[PDB]
Amino acid sequence: MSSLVRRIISTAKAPAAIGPYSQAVLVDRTIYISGQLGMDPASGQLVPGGVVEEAKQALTNIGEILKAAGCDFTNVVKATVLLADINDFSAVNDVYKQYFQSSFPARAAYQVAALPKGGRVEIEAYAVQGPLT
Amino acid sequence: MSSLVRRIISTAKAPAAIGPYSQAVLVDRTIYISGQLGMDPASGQLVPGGVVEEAKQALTNIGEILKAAGCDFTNVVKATVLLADINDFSAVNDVYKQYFQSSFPARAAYQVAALPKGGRVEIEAYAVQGPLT
Amino acid sequence: MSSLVRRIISTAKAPAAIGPYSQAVLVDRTIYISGQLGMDPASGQLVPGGVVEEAKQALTNIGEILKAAGCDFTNVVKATVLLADINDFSAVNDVYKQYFQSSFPARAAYQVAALPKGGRVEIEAYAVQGPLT
Amino acid sequence: GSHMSSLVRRIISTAKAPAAIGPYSQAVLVDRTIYISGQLGMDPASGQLVPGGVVEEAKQALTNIGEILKAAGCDFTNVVKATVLLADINDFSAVNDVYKQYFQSSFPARAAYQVAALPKGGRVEIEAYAVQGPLTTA
Amino acid sequence: GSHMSSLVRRIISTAKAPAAIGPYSQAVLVDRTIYISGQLGMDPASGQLVPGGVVEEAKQALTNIGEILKAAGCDFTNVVKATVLLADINDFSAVNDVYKQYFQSSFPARAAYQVAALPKGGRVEIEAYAVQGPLTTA
Amino acid sequence: GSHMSSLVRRIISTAKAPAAIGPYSQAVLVDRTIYISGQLGMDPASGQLVPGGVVEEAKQALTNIGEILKAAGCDFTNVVKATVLLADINDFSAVNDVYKQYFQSSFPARAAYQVAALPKGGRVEIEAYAVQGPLTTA
Ligand code: NI
Ligand code: NI
Ligand code: NI
């Protein structure tokens, strides 16, 4: 069968791996993006200011990974929003909405027991390289 | 490269979005379905009767989204079952089994800390548009 | 449209299903693998020794499912690591690292409230059948 | 035999073009490519060449191709290659004046040359390849 | 050169059909499409035309195509287009009586016409295109 | 018309090969397959056959194909089928001696035969099919 493209996505505009994973993997046309915490890309540290600031940084991180793969947020087809606190759902929703102009992805969003580094939010995503009709 | 089909799936036979997401996204042949709670499609409210009733409604909701995309449960390849209580695993399993006549999907099933709206169960799914061999 | 290959993956070298799911589903070239606990394939029981032993068994289980589908760990593109305890992240990371020689998958890793059978870890994965470039 | 996708193979058949009598089809669509049998200036109803020589024949042949394309959900914009077979190379310019009426832009690849003889005494035969849309032209 | 999938390109080669001597292959499979070099009524063992004229030649040519299809994991049901080249248009009916024996249904697209000359003095040459299965016929 | 992928269809055009004047393109790339119009031994600059007979013409024709392949991001290793049309079957060996210079291994499928006449009085015309890489040869 055809040999499908498989490319590790890696940019210094997103945080370095603090464990055994790639930022994202592009395979054929689908990009599987690792869960992103609200880590400042230069320092590798959670940004201050709690869940809202962290959500903004996490989504910014995803945006830079998408850009490295020739995509933007319009390429995203599914996301998962992992919360440390379900009471933050409204606040996180309002952040998240700002990163999608259109064609809102499929999503699941819920509270887990704990995230790495005591993050308040982690977002994973799936995207498909364009062109998309 | 080819421009792949990307279609937002939306039916009034499933609940309206109470946040910034689509019910499902079809991209090429893969359908990414949002996490469904046991919400009555007409009202947008959780059905009464607890985890069993909610699981039935959530899976019914998924079925209507699949139908909107020209599919049924035989198109589903993976599901995730998110529980508010791991003690409900048996009861939810017996509900879930009724929606698959065959070719049971891959699955993961476990307890999270909280779901939106105080749901007792949420189910996400991945499907592939047929024909399938 | 073309009729895509859809094959239920099933091997006696991985645990039997204790519920209504397949070990994995191959659909076109993508393999959706069910969440694996650290269950001994012969007995269906969690191996003793806690999170480290369980992680090793879970990943071994995934390896046998990949082998049944003509793949190995280099085919994996995404994994999710579900922990019963976020303090086990380091220990689980060191186990997990041993199963990837290269091209580390995308990943998300975090603590949930409870796993089936009181497992300490569950790992799901997504793979793509080769050849991969 | 089941480890790769099963690709669509559709037999095209329309009463609006000469019937394909014997062990051939008017066209075969397979995956997205349509292979169209060479068409002569044969009248579908009569089973004979239309009168009036190479120009009338070219018109009927291209009409025939058009009806086959339509049966496959396509039109002339789907054509990516055509071969124009002639009884006389010196009829090329006159056949080209017919042919150019069917194409606007993004023209098919083409070969045109003279053969020793065509079926039915034909003076022109056109074979085409097309690709089922949608197509994005660059 | 690495940003798109690398498609399979397989050279077909079988001792059961005339050897392809010089810078050509008996057939090339690329992705799922098999392009088969035109086959004459050449005996594989002798390297010459079989005796007995156009009918014997057509049988050998189609036998040759069959062995090449088999080498590519296919049979005659995989064929989607064929071209029948003749030394004499008036041999069409007799060659067609041979050809029809190889196909049952879902027939290939076809063109048949007379050329000025074929290699080796041949009276018939058949070129075919096939698509590696599985195929779903509609 | 939007429920299947929209496949790329690219018109190939290069000044380095004879211009395609009238309702045809030098080549069409569609999905990954390139259909290349038959090329004569025509000088691009002059619009006429090069002098010196069939051997000089074959060289120019293959040079023409080369420039078209290059315009489509390909070279001769991308070619999967070619057809060699001749004014004289007895020129096959001499044209083959030219042709073999363009191919090293993994040769295209081929048909070669004599036609009654080619455009422009040509003695050789070559049509080719190619597939945009990357390609994995087995
Ligand atoms: Ni198969
Ligand atoms: Ni490339
Ligand atoms: Ni469409």
Side-chain angles (χ1 to χ4, degrees):
Chain A
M1 275 183 312
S2 64
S3 188
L4 301 178
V5 166
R6 192 267 295 289
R7 181 150 80 80
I8 304 311
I9 309 296
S10 174
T11 170
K13 295 290 175 41
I18 72 203
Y21 53 87
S22 295
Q23 288 168 352
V25 174
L26 166 66
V27 55
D28 195 21
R29 299 267 292 251
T30 303
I31 307 164
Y32 295 80
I33 304 173
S34 290
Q36 296 306 298
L37 296 165
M39 282 155 74
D40 156 53
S43 72
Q45 304 314 130
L46 291 175
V47 295
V51 69
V52 169
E53 289 311 302
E54 290 179 32
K56 295 169 176 189
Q57 187 69 55
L59 286 161
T60 297
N61 293 344
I62 293 171
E64 291 305 322
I65 290 167
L66 285 164
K67 185 177 308 183
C71 290
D72 65 19
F73 289 97
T74 74
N75 300 88
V76 174
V77 299
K78 172 75 185 297
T80 297
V81 178
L82 307 167
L83 295 172
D85 185 355
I86 200 69
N87 287 136
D88 298 327
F89 181 101
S90 287
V92 172
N93 269 348
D94 201 55
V95 170
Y96 177 104
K97 169 159 37 54
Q98 301 322 130
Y99 288 78
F100 304 91
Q101 266 55 70
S102 69
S103 298
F104 292 120
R107 200 181 73 162
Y110 47 86
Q111 194 192 320
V112 297
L115 295 169
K117 292 187 74 104
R120 305 304 300 166
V121 58
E122 177 164 352
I123 304 173
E124 61 174 6
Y126 311 62
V128 176
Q129 287 197 314
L132 304 177
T133 285
Chain B
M1 275 183 312
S2 64
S3 188
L4 301 178
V5 166
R6 192 267 295 289
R7 181 150 80 80
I8 304 311
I9 309 296
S10 174
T11 170
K13 295 290 175 41
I18 72 203
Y21 53 87
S22 295
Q23 288 168 352
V25 174
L26 166 66
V27 55
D28 195 21
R29 299 267 292 251
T30 303
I31 307 164
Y32 295 80
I33 304 173
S34 290
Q36 296 306 298
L37 296 165
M39 282 155 74
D40 156 53
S43 72
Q45 304 314 130
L46 291 175
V47 295
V51 69
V52 169
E53 289 311 302
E54 290 179 32
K56 295 169 176 189
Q57 187 69 55
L59 286 161
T60 297
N61 293 344
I62 293 171
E64 291 305 322
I65 290 167
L66 285 164
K67 185 177 308 183
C71 290
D72 65 19
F73 289 97
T74 74
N75 300 88
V76 174
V77 299
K78 172 75 185 297
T80 297
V81 178
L82 307 167
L83 295 172
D85 185 355
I86 200 69
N87 287 136
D88 298 327
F89 181 101
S90 287
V92 172
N93 269 348
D94 201 55
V95 170
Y96 177 104
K97 169 159 37 54
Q98 301 322 130
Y99 288 78
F100 304 91
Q101 266 55 70
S102 69
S103 298
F104 292 120
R107 200 181 73 162
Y110 47 86
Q111 194 192 320
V112 297
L115 295 169
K117 292 187 74 104
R120 305 304 300 166
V121 58
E122 177 164 352
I123 304 173
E124 61 174 6
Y126 311 62
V128 176
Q129 287 197 314
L132 304 177
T133 285
Chain C
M1 275 183 312
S2 64
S3 188
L4 301 178
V5 166
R6 192 267 295 289
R7 181 150 80 80
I8 304 311
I9 309 296
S10 174
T11 170
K13 295 290 175 41
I18 72 203
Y21 53 87
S22 295
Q23 288 168 352
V25 174
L26 166 66
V27 55
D28 195 21
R29 299 267 292 251
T30 303
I31 307 164
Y32 295 80
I33 304 173
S34 290
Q36 296 306 298
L37 296 165
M39 282 155 74
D40 156 53
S43 72
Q45 304 314 130
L46 291 175
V47 295
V51 69
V52 169
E53 289 311 302
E54 290 179 32
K56 295 169 176 189
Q57 187 69 55
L59 286 161
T60 297
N61 293 344
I62 293 171
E64 291 305 322
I65 290 167
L66 285 164
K67 185 177 308 183
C71 290
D72 65 19
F73 289 97
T74 74
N75 300 88
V76 174
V77 299
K78 172 75 185 297
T80 297
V81 178
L82 307 167
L83 295 172
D85 185 355
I86 200 69
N87 287 136
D88 298 327
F89 181 101
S90 287
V92 172
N93 269 348
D94 201 55
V95 170
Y96 177 104
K97 169 159 37 54
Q98 301 322 130
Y99 288 78
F100 304 91
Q101 266 55 70
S102 69
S103 298
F104 292 120
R107 200 181 73 162
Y110 47 86
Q111 194 192 320
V112 297
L115 295 169
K117 292 187 74 104
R120 305 304 300 166
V121 58
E122 177 164 352
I123 304 173
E124 61 174 6
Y126 311 62
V128 176
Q129 287 197 314
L132 304 177
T133 285
Chain D
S2 59
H3 65 305
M4 279 187 309
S5 64
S6 193
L7 297 182
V8 169
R9 185 252 302 278
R10 206 160 81 65
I11 309 303
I12 312 298
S13 177
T14 171
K16 300 231 70 163
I21 52 259
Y24 82 115
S25 307
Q26 291 172 333
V28 173
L29 164 64
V30 55
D31 196 11
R32 297 275 294 257
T33 305
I34 310 166
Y35 293 97
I36 305 172
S37 292
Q39 298 297 302
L40 289 166
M42 303 270 297
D43 167 44
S46 82
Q48 234 182 128
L49 292 179
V50 299
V54 70
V55 171
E56 290 309 302
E57 289 179 39
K59 293 170 168 155
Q60 184 69 41
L62 285 158
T63 297
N64 292 344
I65 289 171
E67 294 296 340
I68 295 173
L69 282 167
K70 187 193 185 177
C74 291
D75 65 22
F76 284 95
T77 73
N78 295 88
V79 176
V80 300
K81 184 206 155 96
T83 299
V84 179
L85 305 175
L86 302 164
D88 187 347
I89 198 68
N90 286 327
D91 293 327
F92 173 69
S93 186
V95 169
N96 188 64
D97 287 343
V98 175
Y99 183 100
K100 69 185 189 204
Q101 298 180 57
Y102 292 69
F103 302 93
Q104 320 301 289
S105 73
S106 285
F107 300 110
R110 195 175 62 179
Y113 47 90
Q114 186 194 317
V115 297
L118 294 169
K120 314 277 163 186
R123 295 161 191 62
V124 58
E125 178 159 359
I126 306 180
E127 49 196 317
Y129 302 170
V131 172
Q132 168 179 64
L135 302 181
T136 317
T137 313
Chain E
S2 59
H3 65 305
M4 279 187 309
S5 64
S6 193
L7 297 182
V8 169
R9 185 252 302 278
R10 206 160 81 65
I11 309 303
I12 312 298
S13 177
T14 171
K16 300 231 70 163
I21 52 259
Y24 82 115
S25 307
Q26 291 172 333
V28 173
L29 164 64
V30 55
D31 196 11
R32 297 275 294 257
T33 305
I34 310 166
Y35 293 97
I36 305 172
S37 292
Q39 298 297 302
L40 289 166
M42 303 270 297
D43 167 44
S46 82
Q48 234 182 128
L49 292 179
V50 299
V54 70
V55 171
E56 290 309 302
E57 289 179 39
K59 293 170 168 155
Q60 184 69 41
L62 285 158
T63 297
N64 292 344
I65 289 171
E67 294 296 340
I68 295 173
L69 282 167
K70 187 193 185 177
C74 291
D75 65 22
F76 284 95
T77 73
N78 295 88
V79 176
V80 300
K81 184 206 155 96
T83 299
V84 179
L85 305 175
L86 302 164
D88 187 347
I89 198 68
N90 286 327
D91 293 327
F92 173 69
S93 186
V95 169
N96 188 64
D97 287 343
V98 175
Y99 183 100
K100 69 185 189 204
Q101 298 180 57
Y102 292 69
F103 302 93
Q104 320 301 289
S105 73
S106 285
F107 300 110
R110 195 175 62 179
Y113 47 90
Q114 186 194 317
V115 297
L118 294 169
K120 314 277 163 186
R123 295 161 191 62
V124 58
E125 178 159 359
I126 306 180
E127 49 196 317
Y129 302 170
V131 172
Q132 168 179 64
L135 302 181
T136 317
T137 313
Chain F
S2 59
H3 65 305
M4 279 187 309
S5 64
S6 193
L7 297 182
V8 169
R9 185 252 302 278
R10 206 160 81 65
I11 309 303
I12 312 298
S13 177
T14 171
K16 300 231 70 163
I21 52 259
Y24 82 115
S25 307
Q26 291 172 333
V28 173
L29 164 64
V30 55
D31 196 11
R32 297 275 294 257
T33 305
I34 310 166
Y35 293 97
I36 305 172
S37 292
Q39 298 297 302
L40 289 166
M42 303 270 297
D43 167 44
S46 82
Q48 234 182 128
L49 292 179
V50 299
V54 70
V55 171
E56 290 309 302
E57 289 179 39
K59 293 170 168 155
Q60 184 69 41
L62 285 158
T63 297
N64 292 344
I65 289 171
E67 294 296 340
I68 295 173
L69 282 167
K70 187 193 185 177
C74 291
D75 65 22
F76 284 95
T77 73
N78 295 88
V79 176
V80 300
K81 184 206 155 96
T83 299
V84 179
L85 305 175
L86 302 164
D88 187 347
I89 198 68
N90 286 327
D91 293 327
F92 173 69
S93 186
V95 169
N96 188 64
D97 287 343
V98 175
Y99 183 100
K100 69 185 189 204
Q101 298 180 57
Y102 292 69
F103 302 93
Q104 320 301 289
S105 73
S106 285
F107 300 110
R110 195 175 62 179
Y113 47 90
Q114 186 194 317
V115 297
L118 294 169
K120 314 277 163 186
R123 295 161 191 62
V124 58
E125 178 159 359
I126 306 180
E127 49 196 317
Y129 302 170
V131 172
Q132 168 179 64
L135 302 181
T136 317
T137 313

